[PDB]
mmCIF file of N, CA and C in Angstrom:
data_model
loop_
_atom_site.group_PDB
_atom_site.id
_atom_site.type_symbol
_atom_site.label_atom_id
_atom_site.label_comp_id
_atom_site.label_asym_id
_atom_site.label_seq_id
_atom_site.Cartn_x
_atom_site.Cartn_y
_atom_site.Cartn_z
ATOM 1 N N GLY A 1 7.200 -0.721 8.593
ATOM 2 C CA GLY A 1 5.766 -0.667 8.191
ATOM 3 C C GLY A 1 5.595 -0.434 6.702
ATOM 4 N N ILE A 2 4.367 -0.114 6.297
ATOM 5 C CA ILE A 2 4.034 0.117 4.894
ATOM 6 C C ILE A 2 4.822 1.242 4.223
ATOM 7 N N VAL A 3 5.108 2.314 4.958
ATOM 8 C CA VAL A 3 5.860 3.425 4.384
ATOM 9 C C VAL A 3 7.283 2.995 4.042
ATOM 10 N N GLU A 4 7.867 2.185 4.920
ATOM 11 C CA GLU A 4 9.221 1.687 4.727
ATOM 12 C C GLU A 4 9.305 0.728 3.542
ATOM 13 N N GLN A 5 8.283 -0.111 3.381
ATOM 14 C CA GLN A 5 8.247 -1.091 2.294
ATOM 15 C C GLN A 5 7.744 -0.583 0.940
ATOM 16 N N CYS A 6 6.873 0.423 0.954
ATOM 17 C CA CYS A 6 6.288 0.944 -0.279
ATOM 18 C C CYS A 6 6.607 2.374 -0.686
ATOM 19 N N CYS A 7 6.979 3.207 0.279
ATOM 20 C CA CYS A 7 7.303 4.596 -0.011
ATOM 21 C C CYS A 7 8.805 4.837 -0.106
ATOM 22 N N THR A 8 9.542 4.508 0.954
ATOM 23 C CA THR A 8 10.992 4.703 0.942
ATOM 24 C C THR A 8 11.680 3.675 0.045
ATOM 25 N N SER A 9 11.068 2.504 -0.107
ATOM 26 C CA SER A 9 11.601 1.486 -1.008
ATOM 27 C C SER A 9 10.483 1.143 -2.003
ATOM 28 N N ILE A 10 10.807 0.382 -3.044
ATOM 29 C CA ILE A 10 9.818 0.034 -4.055
ATOM 30 C C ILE A 10 8.753 -0.927 -3.541
ATOM 31 N N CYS A 11 7.501 -0.551 -3.776
ATOM 32 C CA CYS A 11 6.350 -1.337 -3.359
ATOM 33 C C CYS A 11 6.149 -2.568 -4.259
ATOM 34 N N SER A 12 5.257 -3.455 -3.836
ATOM 35 C CA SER A 12 4.934 -4.658 -4.590
ATOM 36 C C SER A 12 3.517 -5.064 -4.212
ATOM 37 N N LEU A 13 2.851 -5.790 -5.109
ATOM 38 C CA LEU A 13 1.484 -6.259 -4.873
ATOM 39 C C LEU A 13 1.440 -7.191 -3.654
ATOM 40 N N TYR A 14 2.474 -8.021 -3.515
ATOM 41 C CA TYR A 14 2.573 -8.953 -2.403
ATOM 42 C C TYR A 14 2.449 -8.197 -1.081
ATOM 43 N N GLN A 15 3.237 -7.133 -0.945
ATOM 44 C CA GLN A 15 3.235 -6.304 0.258
ATOM 45 C C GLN A 15 1.941 -5.522 0.463
ATOM 46 N N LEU A 16 1.416 -4.928 -0.604
ATOM 47 C CA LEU A 16 0.174 -4.162 -0.512
ATOM 48 C C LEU A 16 -0.976 -4.995 0.052
ATOM 49 N N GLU A 17 -1.122 -6.225 -0.439
ATOM 50 C CA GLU A 17 -2.185 -7.112 0.021
ATOM 51 C C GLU A 17 -2.080 -7.498 1.496
ATOM 52 N N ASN A 18 -0.913 -7.273 2.095
ATOM 53 C CA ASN A 18 -0.726 -7.550 3.517
ATOM 54 C C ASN A 18 -1.554 -6.549 4.314
ATOM 55 N N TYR A 19 -1.907 -5.432 3.679
ATOM 56 C CA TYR A 19 -2.674 -4.387 4.346
ATOM 57 C C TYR A 19 -4.164 -4.324 4.040
ATOM 58 N N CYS A 20 -4.655 -5.265 3.238
ATOM 59 C CA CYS A 20 -6.081 -5.335 2.938
ATOM 60 C C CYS A 20 -6.715 -6.024 4.140
ATOM 61 N N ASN A 21 -8.008 -5.806 4.350
ATOM 62 C CA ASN A 21 -8.707 -6.455 5.458
ATOM 63 C C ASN A 21 -9.167 -7.873 5.087
ATOM 64 N N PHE B 1 2.197 1.745 -11.669
ATOM 65 C CA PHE B 1 0.991 1.523 -10.823
ATOM 66 C C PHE B 1 1.380 1.041 -9.421
ATOM 67 N N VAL B 2 1.658 -0.254 -9.275
ATOM 68 C CA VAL B 2 2.025 -0.833 -7.977
ATOM 69 C C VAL B 2 3.533 -0.955 -7.701
ATOM 70 N N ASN B 3 4.306 -1.222 -8.746
ATOM 71 C CA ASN B 3 5.743 -1.413 -8.601
ATOM 72 C C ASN B 3 6.594 -0.169 -8.743
ATOM 73 N N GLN B 4 6.469 0.706 -7.753
ATOM 74 C CA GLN B 4 7.198 1.965 -7.714
ATOM 75 C C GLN B 4 7.125 2.495 -6.286
ATOM 76 N N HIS B 5 7.701 3.670 -6.063
ATOM 77 C CA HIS B 5 7.660 4.299 -4.748
ATOM 78 C C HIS B 5 6.290 4.951 -4.649
ATOM 79 N N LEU B 6 5.516 4.529 -3.658
ATOM 80 C CA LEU B 6 4.173 5.056 -3.438
ATOM 81 C C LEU B 6 4.111 5.701 -2.062
ATOM 82 N N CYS B 7 3.879 7.009 -2.036
ATOM 83 C CA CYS B 7 3.818 7.744 -0.780
ATOM 84 C C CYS B 7 2.562 8.600 -0.673
ATOM 85 N N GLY B 8 2.131 8.851 0.560
ATOM 86 C CA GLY B 8 0.965 9.684 0.794
ATOM 87 C C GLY B 8 -0.298 9.250 0.086
ATOM 88 N N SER B 9 -0.976 10.204 -0.547
ATOM 89 C CA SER B 9 -2.218 9.908 -1.257
ATOM 90 C C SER B 9 -2.005 8.871 -2.363
ATOM 91 N N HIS B 10 -0.797 8.829 -2.919
ATOM 92 C CA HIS B 10 -0.471 7.883 -3.982
ATOM 93 C C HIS B 10 -0.500 6.447 -3.453
ATOM 94 N N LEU B 11 -0.034 6.263 -2.222
ATOM 95 C CA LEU B 11 -0.022 4.949 -1.582
ATOM 96 C C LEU B 11 -1.449 4.558 -1.201
ATOM 97 N N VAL B 12 -2.179 5.511 -0.628
ATOM 98 C CA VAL B 12 -3.567 5.310 -0.213
ATOM 99 C C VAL B 12 -4.455 4.900 -1.408
ATOM 100 N N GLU B 13 -4.203 5.510 -2.558
ATOM 101 C CA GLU B 13 -4.937 5.212 -3.781
ATOM 102 C C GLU B 13 -4.672 3.783 -4.267
ATOM 103 N N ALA B 14 -3.417 3.354 -4.160
ATOM 104 C CA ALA B 14 -3.015 2.009 -4.570
ATOM 105 C C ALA B 14 -3.718 0.958 -3.709
ATOM 106 N N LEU B 15 -3.744 1.170 -2.391
ATOM 107 C CA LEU B 15 -4.409 0.251 -1.467
ATOM 108 C C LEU B 15 -5.897 0.165 -1.794
ATOM 109 N N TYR B 16 -6.503 1.318 -2.082
ATOM 110 C CA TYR B 16 -7.919 1.393 -2.438
ATOM 111 C C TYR B 16 -8.244 0.542 -3.671
ATOM 112 N N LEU B 17 -7.437 0.690 -4.716
ATOM 113 C CA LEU B 17 -7.615 -0.054 -5.963
ATOM 114 C C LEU B 17 -7.323 -1.551 -5.835
ATOM 115 N N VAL B 18 -6.277 -1.892 -5.094
ATOM 116 C CA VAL B 18 -5.897 -3.290 -4.913
ATOM 117 C C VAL B 18 -6.815 -4.067 -3.962
ATOM 118 N N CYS B 19 -7.124 -3.484 -2.808
ATOM 119 C CA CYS B 19 -7.964 -4.163 -1.825
ATOM 120 C C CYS B 19 -9.446 -4.222 -2.163
ATOM 121 N N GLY B 20 -9.916 -3.250 -2.940
ATOM 122 C CA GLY B 20 -11.314 -3.213 -3.341
ATOM 123 C C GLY B 20 -12.321 -3.249 -2.205
ATOM 124 N N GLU B 21 -13.312 -4.130 -2.327
ATOM 125 C CA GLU B 21 -14.362 -4.270 -1.321
ATOM 126 C C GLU B 21 -13.902 -4.801 0.024
ATOM 127 N N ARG B 22 -12.691 -5.343 0.064
ATOM 128 C CA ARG B 22 -12.131 -5.864 1.302
ATOM 129 C C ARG B 22 -11.749 -4.723 2.235
ATOM 130 N N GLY B 23 -11.413 -3.574 1.657
ATOM 131 C CA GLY B 23 -10.992 -2.449 2.465
ATOM 132 C C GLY B 23 -9.535 -2.639 2.868
ATOM 133 N N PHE B 24 -9.017 -1.725 3.680
ATOM 134 C CA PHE B 24 -7.631 -1.799 4.106
ATOM 135 C C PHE B 24 -7.391 -0.920 5.313
ATOM 136 N N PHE B 25 -6.176 -0.986 5.835
ATOM 137 C CA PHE B 25 -5.787 -0.140 6.946
ATOM 138 C C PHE B 25 -4.479 0.546 6.569
ATOM 139 N N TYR B 26 -4.400 1.837 6.870
ATOM 140 C CA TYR B 26 -3.223 2.640 6.573
ATOM 141 C C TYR B 26 -2.646 3.153 7.881
ATOM 142 N N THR B 27 -1.443 2.697 8.206
ATOM 143 C CA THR B 27 -0.777 3.096 9.437
ATOM 144 C C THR B 27 0.645 3.568 9.140
ATOM 145 N N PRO B 28 0.819 4.886 8.940
ATOM 146 C CA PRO B 28 2.097 5.542 8.641
ATOM 147 C C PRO B 28 3.146 5.311 9.723
ATOM 148 N N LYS B 29 2.710 5.351 10.979
ATOM 149 C CA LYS B 29 3.592 5.149 12.125
ATOM 150 C C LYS B 29 3.411 3.761 12.733
ATOM 151 N N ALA B 30 4.172 2.797 12.222
ATOM 152 C CA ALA B 30 4.111 1.418 12.707
ATOM 153 C C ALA B 30 5.412 0.667 12.416
#
């Protein structure tokens, strides 16, 4: 999930936008 | 800003700024 992709590992804009509505 | 380790309120803040008026969903356990 988001914690695995952005918190435990380095986040990216590409990934963040996957969570916008 | 976006390209770093973002956790907790720091992650929530990033989603808020990036998604803007679109809003977002935060699911820690998924």
